[PDB]
Amino acid sequence: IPVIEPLFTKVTEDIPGAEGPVFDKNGDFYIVAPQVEVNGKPAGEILRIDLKTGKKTVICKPEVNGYGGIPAGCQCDRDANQLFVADMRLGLLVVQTDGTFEEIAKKDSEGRRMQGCNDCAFDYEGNLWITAPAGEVAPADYTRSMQEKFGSIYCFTTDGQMIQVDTAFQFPNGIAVRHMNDGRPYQLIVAETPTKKLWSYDIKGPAKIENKKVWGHIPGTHEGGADGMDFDEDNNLLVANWGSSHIEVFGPDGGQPKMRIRCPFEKPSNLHFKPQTKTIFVTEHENNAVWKFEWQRNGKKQYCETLKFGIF
Numbered sequence: 001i002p003v004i005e006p007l008f009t010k011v012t013e014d015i016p017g018a019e020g021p022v023f024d025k026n027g028d029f030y031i032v033a034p035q036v037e038v039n040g041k042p043a044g045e046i047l048r049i050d051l052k053t054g055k056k057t058v059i060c061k062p063e064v065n066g067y068g069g070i071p072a073g074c075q076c077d078r079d080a081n082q083l084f085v086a087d088m089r090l091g092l093l094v095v096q097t098d099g100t101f102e103e104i105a106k107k108d109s110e111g112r113r114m115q116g117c118n119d120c121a122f123d124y125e126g127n128l129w130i131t132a133p134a135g136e137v138a139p140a141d142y143t144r145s146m147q148e149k150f151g152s153i154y155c156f157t158t159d160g161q162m163i164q165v166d167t168a169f170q171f172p173n174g175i176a177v178r179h180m181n182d183g184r185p186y187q188l189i190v191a192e193t194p195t196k197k198l199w200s201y202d203i204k205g206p207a208k209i210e211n212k213k214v215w216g217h218i219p220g221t222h223e224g225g226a227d228g229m230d231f232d233e234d235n236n237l238l239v240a241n242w243g244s245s246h247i248e249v250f251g252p253d254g255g256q257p258k259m260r261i262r263c264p265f266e267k268p269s270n271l272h273f274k275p276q277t278k279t280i281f282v283t284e285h286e287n288n289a290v291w292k293f294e295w296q297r298n299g300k301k302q303y304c305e306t307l308k309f310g311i312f
């Protein structure tokens with residue numbers, strides 16, 4: 001398996017458990033610091049990073065009734081410049097640029113208590129696919145599916161329903177949506193960290209997934225595995241293999257990685273392309289920092305880059 005060693009450039013530092021890299025509609029960059037604590041309790045933060053200086057600004061420190069959040073993954077909305085943030089303690093949050101936020105759900109479409117989420121992915125239809133490796137959201141005692149199979153997958157639809165689409169995952173983590181060339185969502189990829197597997201489903205419609213399959217295999221016997229992921233314009237899936245020092249590159253058909261990217265650190269967490277460029281911003285937990293490197297091509301357009309009223 002060929003390995004490339006592109007130059008990694010420092011972006012920002014000292015961000016506890018750096019995760020959820022994301023760009024909004026104005027090209028602003030954001031990162032989440034899920035591991036920030038205040039007296040042993042969760043006090044996670046959502047930060048805006050100045051790309052010119054690397055200076056950090058905490059725009060939101062979500063807390064619902066005294067229970068601080070553990071924000072872990074982000075996606076930018078299209079019809080409004082707002083962030084949908086997966087929180088391991090609070091579920092799904094919608095965060096504005098001014099720093100205000102709203103907690104989307106305490107319960108799913110079935111009246112079942114919501115589970116703490118880790119990452120999410122918008123499909124071109126506007127539906128949000130979310131991974132939920134944690135147990136029930138606050139006030140319930142914090143638990144996570146690293147050992148037991150209680151991790152779930154949700155789909156927050158356009159009509160506002162929080163639908164649980166699957167369960168029994170051992171820490172579902174990264175998530176991405178594969179689209180047909182005409183923009184139709186047709187395949188969902190879900191990372192299951194400890195088991196070193198990438199799972200796939202055929203998306204038949206909003207919140208409708210079928211034919212669960214072990215799509216790809218993550219290298220290594222190290223503690224960790226597939227964390228964050230994202231597609232490039234040619235539909236190759238780059239996955240952060242936490243603990244391996246590499247970001248794995250999968251072809252459209254999955255299986256074994258067709259290339260690996262060596263990072264000058266052991267714990268790559270999440271990654272995100274900068275709109276209209278080959279630049280991939282990567283968060284890592286060895287030093288708890290953010291980096292950037294040039295990939296072989298542009299990233300797949302995120303939902304926020306598409307046009308609602310576009311003709312073509």
Ligand SMILES: [Ca+2]
Nearest residue numbers: 119173227228
């Ligand atoms: Ca993650």
Ligand SMILES: [Ca+2]
Nearest residue numbers: 229230271272
């Ligand atoms: Ca991403």
